[PDB]
């Protein structure tokens, strides 16, 4: 078995240099790949392993020199496989890619930082190896901006970072597989400890093999396209994995960094520096599977998960809190609680005596947590309970009061150090996570609210709210929100959809306010859209209404957005209802689908500028919600610069960002990764509030305004004006098969306009072409270079000195690293009509030209010249993804064309749809985020 | 704050050299003491801290040169303290000693072993730094003894180490403090990791301080001398601490060591290599607090703790067991289980589908475990349930059957590696721990069984079983055991004691046999005692009777023991009840109270010789149960040689040892210490079975017979013949205050004959005198040296070549290391009449002579010359213990003599019985095990 000598050689050719001297990435993936191929040989034979290894070697050679012969050599093997071998090979390359991902995460997590590699400017903040940690950000604010530590501390107290967990656009990886990946990363990391004994190392090797086999031997296709409740369960796994333990550890490090600049206080335990929100079970935009019952279910499930975690954590807390000296107030509470009926600690104590007063109070808290868990479970599984609401915690203050009593009491007696231990961690967990872990946002199209109001006005013989102008809509809505008479009853003709909308509001009214965040209006365009939701909320008897958040998607909607928000703030009722706070959402992917990516980027910078101007005019604290597709939605270090790049005063101590599902494992799967994620969000938010990016030079604004026009021209001329573009899109890409398959929901929700943004990005990401991300950049840069010889220099100045522009281009460059026009050409050759071949050829030429122009702008000769660690890891993954690409292409030809007969090969040792699904899930997991 | 500089110097003067180069003990204790004294100053003022540190400095100066002036310097300070300051000082020195122990444990756990320090003989097996680990034991058996790997493996399959956890003779440390000590050890160890970052180190220092203060600020008195259920709760904590996770790790290491000699199998997962037993709630010998209800309680509590641990452990198992390929048998069971009513994993899955068959079966197991816990809880708190017994696991086979089914199926599909992971660990935990974690032994005096049978026979108008000769007793008992008529009914005059005995039997009958171990007869002398218990068992309707175990205590009882066991094996009924297995218990401490320690040692070697001869005669497998006080009851390396020293064939793959409460923390408190404990018990049992110690030369046996005669003469002439000895014992020692206080139970079952062994040893251990351990050795060695010039050379030969003798002497040497005649003389000066002073002076001279003679025998100039690490650790503790000694002496004088007025000092910043209790608990924790 000298086969190992070959994969090592190929791996070393793929990743040649060393990005440091703790660079063990090739070692890691070589070990995992060797062990996997041995498992594969033992289960499916020697021939199967040899076939698979020949394929991988060819793929890696291709990612080296991109010789098209290597692609033809891959295809020759992949077409000759009967569906059984096709399934085994596809599964095999999926798991091989997963192992490359795990090795990459370990390498990232244990890479030593380099203080001497910092250049001293903001470019350092684009990579994890040079970004500023918490304390370096503190000292940068103290030295360069001459801010006093007390100002830094006061900024932190009132700062909030709000991370929003959304469903994965594909395989929301099951909780069990997350755990297996964790065990693999742990075995890997421990195997390279520079002190380990022979027997420990042998047992770790055997544990690693055992786990890799375990992951390879579980099916990941059948049953259902998981119900929204299941997807929510899988999405909540990261709280148990890292986030629950991670929040108090991070906050304590904030305390230590504050001590290292002279601050003696800690960050107050009730200060919400970190918050979590969820769309899982709340986003109904084009998703009929998300019903009123789904929302009720995930709300109660979240209350259960939280009560479970508090219940298990408070037993350790009860063992630690064995003091007897206490406050007079706490002693009074101990005597009161002792007069009652001790069922959840008989294994610990027969009963808690009054000479352990902290244990008395905490034991009663444990009892209330148990009743809350069992009660929410009874509500979920039936619809009623029998658990008195007074025996549980219904709001966060009931929970915090006795814990704070313990903290005050402990501090009274000089036991502050004891109080700053498990008790401080607990208080910070209650403040961060509340009774729900997450707050659920609800999202719905504006048109659905319009349908509801139209049925209402038609039922009252007043006209159709739909035909009314925006001004008449506003006038009627305003008369109703200010009036004293209810609007509608059961005697109302309701369609199925209208009943969905109203029932969602009724379920919101029947659940605790701690469970909900924002009501987000998709396709928001006018103030009447927001006022419709405020009115529907009020008339559905929602006592504590949700905050309404418009999502301005199309480009024209963004241009009209500050006008609409100003008109909203100018209405007296809405002004006094919002209580000085407004949240607006922007969708980078959504706007890019409308007008190309470069135009959407520059338009979103300008739109935030004007919205801040409005908020200052009316004295409102604005919160910008960054949807998916942004620079701030990337994985790792880049986010740090992206946050710093936002326009001045757009954050103001309140950051709300979508954590994309294709990135959540890279960000929260591992202990170190979790800490560093929380750290860069916190540090960048704090720094941006006190140190905005430079204001753009006037010529930069004018130049980008010009480029936006040319870029929208090219993008729309190809996507919307070319008649046969849609025909090509249906051939060169698995868009049709993606919706028809099983993943997500509905993609339409006519033409591309009705197509959702996620399938729009996905379809082209599968083919390694990425047209939605880069299209438009080429013609814009060509146009400005040709108009004036000097514009190139100006572009090169912007990329070097304007953070916004650098992050925009940097994201484009990263997407180009994951692109390969040769593979896209293979899709054309197999799946596209001949008379459409020049069309794709032209698009590929555009791909090439933009690439060179993007390089010229960034001052680079190769892609990602400034981030070799990412270039290295991407090359590693691409070697596995390429095989799944060729396999997916030929599998598509086999599905669509039963007249394409292939010379089959004999089956290799112990359904084309399953193959296709495997390749989609795999390629998606290897490319992760693009646009 | 340069106070740290003086204590560093004093520690370095106390422990001068370095016992290695990873010797960080002085550093460790300096760190712990600095942090503690800072906490003490912060809580109780600067004056209190200065007073305490002056005391410690004087104590270390004393342990340096033993100048008696230092003791008067301590006493002048300690008598002038009013009871409040007295309590604070005593508490402080107790916690300082605890911190010294924790540092010593960390040093032991992280001390690197030395391969080049092995000498190649059995002496290496007397210290943890040189003892043979598992694999070294294997190669010792394979190379030197010519045993085949198959033979070693077959021995391991059938080997059992049965460790019996007994109640602490003093403070059974509460579970909370065990956890706190764990955190202190963890912070200590992590602070010295040769890679730690500045912020991690800062936060670790703060966690260390936080924990030391937390432990110091909890009261450890009031309430009750904890109920036996509470003491049992505290005693079981080590399962959560280390043993539960620790057992499968060790067993897996046994598998690895087997692979390194060619064995390809694993130790069968159902093989009971490790077993745990408990006396907590079962020993009634002179302890009326242990009632039938107490035994029932700890039985149900144990079943609960076990069900909880299995329940929590099986969820991660359910996440790992996501395979789909399975057995025909398993697939059948999965389809069967799928037909039923999923309440304990909605947070995980809505329901378990049939395409995850292992999860189906395991989920049903998790459900049955939940019902087992809640049912045991309902019986404990009420007396009945309503949970059908068929919905739970009642015996170990019901539990193992589905788990083994999963293992077989996984192996069927080539998934054995997956099976040897969490599933193998789980199976090994079920086999080791059963449904109870521990099996409870029941212990009672034989005389109580005589009382029950006497009330029975008198009630039957047949005579008094008590007046009957032993032979008449045997004949009647045999006629009843072989007959069919029952013995008695409700119509039976029962005294409180007789009803206690019968009620205990009734509780045993109504509980699962898996909860119980052995029925132990204290003060056993004749076969009728065992037959009495067997008959009472049967007639109280115990369906599965316990195995009866006689405890032969007095020396004459030991001489008659092999005859009595032979007579038992010769009776057909008993021979058919025991099914080829018999367990006999011997009490090293118990026998020593009767006839001195040297005589009890030689008598126990001979008695084990003869018991083995009988067992081979009648074809019975003998198990020797070692009670408290033995060489095999020591801490650490000594146990390895102690086990290897037992007479040939006395173990035979079945070791049963009392884990004394004064050692259980040193043995199972930490992860590494736990593994090494389990390893040395396993390795020494295995080696002893295949490589018995040398048979003693005839002159060795003759010499020990003579020494035993002289030693028993001296011991009885001092302890039992001296008329004024009892008065001296009541004056020079805190024996009266110990029984009167609160600890344990009753110390007198009159004179010393009725005094129990535990208070006998404790009283003299408190004064650093240890007379019960060494008395008699002096005259025994003096006699033989004078009788023949060459006998010294013979003694030195035995110590060098006879393991039994070396371990016997080694224990004495270790006890002398914990002795200090100067402190004992201080007790004499304060508490003993003037005319009794020469008596104590003479005993102290005996102490000195015996010490010199033991040194001569061991070939040593100083004590513990061969184990410098232990000498160092004991010398470290002695500096703290000495202060509690002086404090205890003056406190005793103040309690007994209110005519002793002292010039008190003003109270120092922010009830003498409490102080006395503090000093007793402290000295007890610092001297740990002696005899
Ligand atoms: Cl559900
Ligand atoms: Cl109880």
Swiss-Prot record, chains A, B:
Keyword terms, alphabetized: Allosteric enzyme, Carbon dioxide fixation, Cytoplasm, Lyase, Magnesium, Manganese, Phosphoprotein, Photosynthesis
Subcellular location, record wording: Cytoplasm
Enzyme class: lyase
Co-factor note (free text): Magnesium. Can also use manganese.
Notes on activation and inhibition: By light-reversible phosphorylation. Activated by inorganic phosphate (Pi) deprivation and glucose 6-phosphate. Inhibited by L-malate and L-aspartate.
Gene Ontology MF annotations: phosphoenolpyruvate carboxylase activity
PROSITE patterns in the record: PEPCASE_1, PEPCASE_2
Phosphoserine found at: 6, 695
Reaction catalyzed: oxaloacetate + phosphate = phosphoenolpyruvate + hydrogencarbonate
Induction / repression: Upon inorganic phosphate (Pi) deprivation.
Tissues with expression: Expressed in all plant organs, with higher levels in roots.
Coiled-coil annotated spans: none
Chief site of localization: cytoplasm
Summary of subunit composition and partner proteins: Homotetramer.
Function: Through the carboxylation of phosphoenolpyruvate (PEP) it forms oxaloacetate, a four-carbon dicarboxylic acid source for the tricarboxylic acid cycle. Contributes probably to the adaptation to inorganic phosphate (Pi) deprivation.
Record protein name field: Phosphoenolpyruvate carboxylase 1
Organism: Arabidopsis thaliana
């Amino acid at each position: 078995l000298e086969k190992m000598a070959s994969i090592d050689v190929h791996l070393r050719q793929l990743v040649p240099g060393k990005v440091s001297e703790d660079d063990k990435l090739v070692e890691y993936d070589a070990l995992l790949l060797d062990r996997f191929l041995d498992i594969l040989q033992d289960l499916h034979g020697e021939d199967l392993r040899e076939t698979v290894q020949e394929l991988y070697e060819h793929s890696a050679e291709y990612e080296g020199k991109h010789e098209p012969k290597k692609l033809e050599e891959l295809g020759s093997v992949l077409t000759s496989l009967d569906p059984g071998d096709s399934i085994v090979i596809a599964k095999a390359f999926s798991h091989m890619l997963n192992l490359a991902n795990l090795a990459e995460e370990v390498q990232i997590a244990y890479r030593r930082r380099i203080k001497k590699l910092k250049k001293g400017d903001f470019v350092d903040e684009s990579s994890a190896t040079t970004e500023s940690d918490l304390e370096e950000t503190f000292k940068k604010l103290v030295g360069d901006l001459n801010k006093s530590p007390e100002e830094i501390f006061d900024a932190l107290k009132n700062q909030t970072v709000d991370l929003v967990l959304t469903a994965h656009p594909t395989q929301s990886v099951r909780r069990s597989l997350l755990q297996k990946h964790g065990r693999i990363r742990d075995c890997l990391a421990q195997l390279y400890a520079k002190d380990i004994t022979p027997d420990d190392k042998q047992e770790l090797d055997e544990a690693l093999q055992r786990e890799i086999q375990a992951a390879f031997r579980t099916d990941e296709i059948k049953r259902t396209p998981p119900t929204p409740q299941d997807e929510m369960r899988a999405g909540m796994s990261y709280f148990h994995e890292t986030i629950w333990k991670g929040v108090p550890k991070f906050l304590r490090r904030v305390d230590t960094a504050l001590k290292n600049i002279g601050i003696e206080e800690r960050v107050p335990y009730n200060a919400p520096l970190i918050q979590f929100s969820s769309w899982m079970g709340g986003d109904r935009d084009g998703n009929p599977r998300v019903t009123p019952e789904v929302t009720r279910d995930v709300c109660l499930l979240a209350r259960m998960m939280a009560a479970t975690m508090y219940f298990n954590q408070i037993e350790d807390l009860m063992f630690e809190m064995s003091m007897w000296r206490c406050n007079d107030e706490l002693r009074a509470r101990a005597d009161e609680v002792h007069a009652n009926s001790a069922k959840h600690y008989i294994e610990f104590w027969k009963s808690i005596p009054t000479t352990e007063p902290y244990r008395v109070i905490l034991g009663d808290v444990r009892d209330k947590l148990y009743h809350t868990r069992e009660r929410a479970h009874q509500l979920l599984s039936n619809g009623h309970s029998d658990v008195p609401v007074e025996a549980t915690f219904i709001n966060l203050e009931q929970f915090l009061e006795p814990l704070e009593l313990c903290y005050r009491s402990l501090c009274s007696c000089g036991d502050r150090p004891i109080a700053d231990g498990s008790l401080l961690d607990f208080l910070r967990q209650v403040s961060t996570f509340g009774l729900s872990l997450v707050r659920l946002d609800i999202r719905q199209e504006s048109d659905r609210h319009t349908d509801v109001l139209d049925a209402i006005t038609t039922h009252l013989d007043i006209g159709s709210y739909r035909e009314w102008s925006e001004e008449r809509r506003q006038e009627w809505l305003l008369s109703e929100l200010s009036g004293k008479r209810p609007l509608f009853g059961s005697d109302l003709p309701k369609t199925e959809e209208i009943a969905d909308v109203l029932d969602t509001f009724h379920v919101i009214a029947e659940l605790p306010a701690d469970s909900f965040g924002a009501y987000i209006i998709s396709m928001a365009t006018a103030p009447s859209d927001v006022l419709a939701v405020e009115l529907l909320q009020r008339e559905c008897r929602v006592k504590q209404p949700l905050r309404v958040v418009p999502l301005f998607e199309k480009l024209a909607d963004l241009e009209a957005a500050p006008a609409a928000v100003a008109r909203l703030f100018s209405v007296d009722w809405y002004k006094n209802r919002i209580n000085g706070k407004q949240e607006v959402m922007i969708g980078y992917s959504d706007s890019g689908k409308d007008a190309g990516r470069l135009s959407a980027a520059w338009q979103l910078y300008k739109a935030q500028e004007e919205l801040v101007k409005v908020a200052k005019e009316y004295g409102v604290k604005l919160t910008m919600f960054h949807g998916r597709g942004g620079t701030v939605g990337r994985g790792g270090g880049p986010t740090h610069l992206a946050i710093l790049s936002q326009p001045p005063d757009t954050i103001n101590g309140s950051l709300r960002v979508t954590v994309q599902g294709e990135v959540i494992e890279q960000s929260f799967g591992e202990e170190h990764l979790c800490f560093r994620t929380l750290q860069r969000f916190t540090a960048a938010t704090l720094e941006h509030g006190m140190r905005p990016p430079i204001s753009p030079k006037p010529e930069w604004r004018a130049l980008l305004d010009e480029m936006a026009v040319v870029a929208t021209e090219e993008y729309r001329s190809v996507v919307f004006q070319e008649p046969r573009f849609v025909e090509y899109f249906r051939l060169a890409t698995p868009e049709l098969e993606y919706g028809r398959m099983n993943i997500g929901s509905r993609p339409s929700k006519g033409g591309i306009e009705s197509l959702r943004a996620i399938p729009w990005i996905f379809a082209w990401t599968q083919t390694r072409f990425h047209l939605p991300v880069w299209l438009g950049f080429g013609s814009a840069i060509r146009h400005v270079i040709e108009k004036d010889v000097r514009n190139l220099h100006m572009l090169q100045d912007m990329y070097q000195h304007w953070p916004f522009f650098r992050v925009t281009i940097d994201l484009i460059e990263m997407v180009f690293a994951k692109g390969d026009p040769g593979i896209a050409a293979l899709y054309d050759k197999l799946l596209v009509s001949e008379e459409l071949w020049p069309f794709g050829e032209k698009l590929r030429a555009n791909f090439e030209e933009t690439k060179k122009l993007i390089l010229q702008t960034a001052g680079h000769k190769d892609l990602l010249e400034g981030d070799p660690y990412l270039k290295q890891g991407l090359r590693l993954r691409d070697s596995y993804i390429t095989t799944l690409n060729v396999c997916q292409a030929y599998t598509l030809k086999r599905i669509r064309d039963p007249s394409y007969h292939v010379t089959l090969r004999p089956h290799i040792s112990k359904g084309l749809e399953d193959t296709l699904i495997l390749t989609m899930k795999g390629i998606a997991a290897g490319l992760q985020n693009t646009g």
